[PDB]
């Protein structure tokens, strides 16, 4: 049964969650710049949301950074799938223009990564998650005790449980007849780790073709 404490936390997260424009070799560069700058906005958003998650700011700053550095791509991918339009097969960022598999590729992304983005968003969208549910997958994604360089693994794992339990209780209210919606939501976290690794190959590709990520994205993503 959803506890008062789980109720309040779930509304806190929901409340918590609630640029070079898009046009030759300069054409390519100002699409990439628009795209990588959209990410810079997401990473600023993730950092702000994360600071409002019970338990987060009580972790060592070093552990906070450990958590946000590796989980950002995964959270960017969840957010992305919230914005999937199943009719147009597009993702609408900023609330104006919507982007499709070739807009992504004109913006510099290799098809080996775009296809999984959209196939993951097609799958996420089939579950029809609402805000509260995305907010809590995002919390669980962040509190992963198995990230490189987490120190207090025990407390990150404890924090994650409180959210996993919150989601359990909530989904039993949202979906009282389908006991499988909860683990279907969790299992989508399995796929995200593969997309996180598909993304590392992307970033390394950008190294090979000597493409330069901006300061915040090079910081969290480049292998220095």
């Amino acid at each position: 049964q959803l506890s008062p404490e789980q109720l309040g936390m779930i509304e806190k997260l929901v409340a918590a969650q609630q640029v070079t424009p898009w046009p030759s070799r300069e054409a390519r560069q100002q699409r990439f710049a628009h795209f990588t700058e959209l990410a810079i906005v997401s990473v600023q958003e993730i950092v702000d949301f994360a600071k409002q998650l019970p338990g987060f700011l009580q972790l060592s700053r070093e552990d906070q950074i450990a958590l946000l550095k590796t989980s950002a791509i995964e959270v960017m991918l969840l957010e992305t799938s919230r914005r999937y339009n199943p009719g147009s097969e597009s993702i609408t960022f900023l609330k104006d223009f919507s982007y499709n598999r070739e807009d992504f590729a004109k913006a510099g992304l290799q098809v080996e990564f775009i296809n999984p983005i959209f196939e993951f968003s097609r799958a996420m969208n089939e579950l029809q998650l609402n805000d509260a549910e995305f907010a809590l997958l995002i919390a669980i994604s962040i509190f992963s005790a198995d990230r490189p360089n987490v120190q207090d693994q025990l407390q990150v794992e404890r924090l994650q449980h409180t959210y996993v339990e919150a989601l359990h209780a909530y989904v039993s209210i949202h979906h009282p007849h389908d006991r499988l919606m909860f683990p279907r939501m969790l299992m989508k976290l399995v796929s995200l780790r593969t997309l996180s690794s598909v993304h590392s190959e992307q970033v390394f590709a950008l190294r090979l073709q000597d493409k330069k990520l901006p300061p915040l994205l090079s910081e969290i993503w480049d292998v220095h």
């Binding site: 700053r61 950074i65 946000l68 910081e219």
Partner: peptide
């Protein structure tokens, strides 16, 4: 530390 190698993210967590 991760903190000295992540100065932009750190400042964001600070502000």
């Amino acid at each position: 530390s991760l903190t000295e190698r992540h100065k932009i993210l750190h400042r964001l967590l600070q502000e």
